[PDB]
Amino acid sequence: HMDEILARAGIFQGVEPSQLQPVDFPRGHTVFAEGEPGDRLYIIISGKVKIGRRAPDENLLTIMGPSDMFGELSIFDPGPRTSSATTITEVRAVSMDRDALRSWIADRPEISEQLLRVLARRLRRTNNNLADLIFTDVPGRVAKQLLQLAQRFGTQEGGALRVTHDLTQEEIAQLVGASRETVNKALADFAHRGWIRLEGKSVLISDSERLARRA
Amino acid sequence: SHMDEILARAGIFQGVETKQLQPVDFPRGHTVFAEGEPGDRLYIIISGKVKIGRRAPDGRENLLTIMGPSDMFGELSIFDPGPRTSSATTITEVRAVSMDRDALRSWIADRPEISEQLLRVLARRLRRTNNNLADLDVPGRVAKQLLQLAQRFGTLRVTHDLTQEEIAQLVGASRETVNKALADFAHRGWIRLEGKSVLISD
Ligand SMILES: C[C@@H](Cc1ccccc1)Nc1ncnc2c1ncn2[C@@H]1O[C@H]2COP(=O)(O)O[C@@H]2[C@H]1O
Ligand SMILES: C[C@H](Cc1ccccc1)Nc1ncnc2c1ncn2[C@@H]1O[C@H]2COP(=O)(O)O[C@@H]2[C@H]1O
Numbered sequence: 001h002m003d004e005i006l007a008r009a010g011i012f013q014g015v016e017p018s019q020l021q022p023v024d025f026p027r028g029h030t031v032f033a034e035g036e037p038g039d040r041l042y043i044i045i046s047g048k049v050k051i052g053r054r055a056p057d058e059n060l061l062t063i064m065g066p067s068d069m070f071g072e073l074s075i076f077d078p079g080p081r082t083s084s085a086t087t088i089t090e091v092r093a094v095s096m097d098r099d100a101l102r103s104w105i106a107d108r109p110e111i112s113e114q115l116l117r118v119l120a121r122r123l124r125r126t127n128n129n130l131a132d133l134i135f136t137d138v139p140g141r142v143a144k145q146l147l148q149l150a151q152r153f154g155t156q157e158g159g160a161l162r163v164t165h166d167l168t169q170e171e172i173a174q175l176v177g178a179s180r181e182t183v184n185k186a187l188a189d190f191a192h193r194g195w196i197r198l199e200g201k202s203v204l205i206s207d208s209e210r211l212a213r214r215a
Numbered sequence: 216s217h218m219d220e221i222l223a224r225a226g227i228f229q230g231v232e233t234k235q236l237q238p239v240d241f242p243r244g245h246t247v248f249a250e251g252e253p254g255d256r257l258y259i260i261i262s263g264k265v266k267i268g269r270r271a272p273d274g275r276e277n278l279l280t281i282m283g284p285s286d287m288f289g290e291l292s293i294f295d296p297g298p299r300t301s302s303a304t305t306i307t308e309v310r311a312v313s314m315d316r317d318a319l320r321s322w323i324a325d326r327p328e329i330s331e332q333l334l335r336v337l338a339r340r341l342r343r344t345n346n347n348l349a350d351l352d353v354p355g356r357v358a359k360q361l362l363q364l365a366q367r368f369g370t371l372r373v374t375h376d377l378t379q380e381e382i383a384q385l386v387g388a389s390r391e392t393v394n395k396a397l398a399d400f401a402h403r404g405w406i407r408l409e410g411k412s413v414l415i416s417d
């Protein structure tokens with residue numbers, strides 16, 4: 001489990017199995033808050049972490065899962081955390097500070113490149129998500145967010161995909177950037193069309209082809 | 216050692232423990248590359264300006280930024296192999312240096328500290344974007360743009376070498392609203408639009 005998942009984290013890709021001790025967090029734990037000094041990045045081994053940024057008075061930007069890396073901004077560009085990280089399931093994680101990062105990094109520049117590729121990918125994606133917030137209708141952003149979650153945690157379930165996302169309705173709405181009421185009706189409508197099925201903290205996507213067209 | 220001056224204040228080089236490569240000339244009005252095509256080159260401007268544009272759904276162009284001397288563009292398709300996320304278009308004659316992935320790899324074997332600066336540069340670009348949720352007016356956004364243009368190329372004669380449509384594309388508002396704001400500002404005595412430049416009052 002751990003070895004299989006960790007190998008896919010960019011900071012470990014290609015690296016053979018080379019005591020930075022893995023930490024455990026309860027569900028609903030704030031790993032760190034927006035604005036705090038930060039000396040540490042984390043790699044998720046298991047569980048989900050939501051990344052949130054407070055509004056003038058909290059909109060979710062993304063859901064981090066197994067293999068993903070969060071909190072690297074303040075290590076790469078020293079500054080306060082640009083958002084909060086909050087576990088939504090129990091999380092088992094491995095973390096490292098600037099010192100260890102640099103140690104691990106001096107070893108290999110290709111790891112440096114993998115890390116760059118993560119930030120570029122986030123930057124590429126940043127444009128698109130931001131353009132959606134300017135240009136895309138609500139129901140369309142819902143379909144879109146569902147598929148974004150589908151590609152990250154989706155698995156094959158008898159010729160369809162099960163996307164177990166672990167989010168409340170409220171957290172889904174905070175991810176889309178719209179009201180819970182509006183987000184629900186869109187979800188509801190997708191359901192009556194039979195493109196998706198809502199089952200607790202998981203959606204069953206029967207027709208991703210359609211949901212894609214709608215996105 | 217003029218090229219040496221400009222390059223020295225590029226993000227990639229914050230650190231001085233020379234480094235000339237071999238540059239390229241681009242005419243004004245040149246598409247260095249277009250949104251969507253494959254990239255394998257990043258550029259560091261020595262002289263001239265470049266607009267970075269992305270396609271809006273209504274077929275208009277959102278200009279994301281105006282790069283000038285010392286700035287880098289095109290690095291995203293080196294680090295994350297894929298299509299250009301924007302187009303880059305010279306608005307003046309441009310001198311710049313280029314590297315493809317092989318070149319960048321070799322640089323980084325040469326000066327390993329270049330890896331840290333690149334990580335810092337992109338991380339900083341993420342951090343800034345986060346801080347700028349102001350998309351959530353038009354004369355108030357234009358003034359901001361004018362000021363942002365003032366810091367980068369001001370001397371406060373601001374030779375921005377931009378077009379009015381280009382200015383509105385920078386703003387993300389209609390040429391209408393924008394041309395309006397930029398008449399109300401002139402009238403009131405603040406700025407005075409003279410060509411592809413401008414002069415402020417406050
Ligand atoms: C951060 C946003 C712009 C913005 C402006 C105001 C508020 C939120 C976001 N996007 C970019 N900003 C500055 N330079 C960029 C942006 N997206 C791509 N670039 C550069 O031009 C790209 C074209 O080819 P590439 O290989 O994809 O990478 C290039 C980037 O250097
Ligand atoms: C522009 C984009 C935010 C966004 C804007 C519009 C729609 C959807 C998302 N930025 C981010 N994208 C992916 N991961 C991020 C983003 N901002 C912060 N993180 C991660 O959480 C941060 C917490 O502290 P840190 O600043 O040390 O670095 C962490 C990043 O890993």
Ligand SMILES: [Cl-]
Nearest residue numbers: 068118121122
């Ligand atoms: Cl990612």
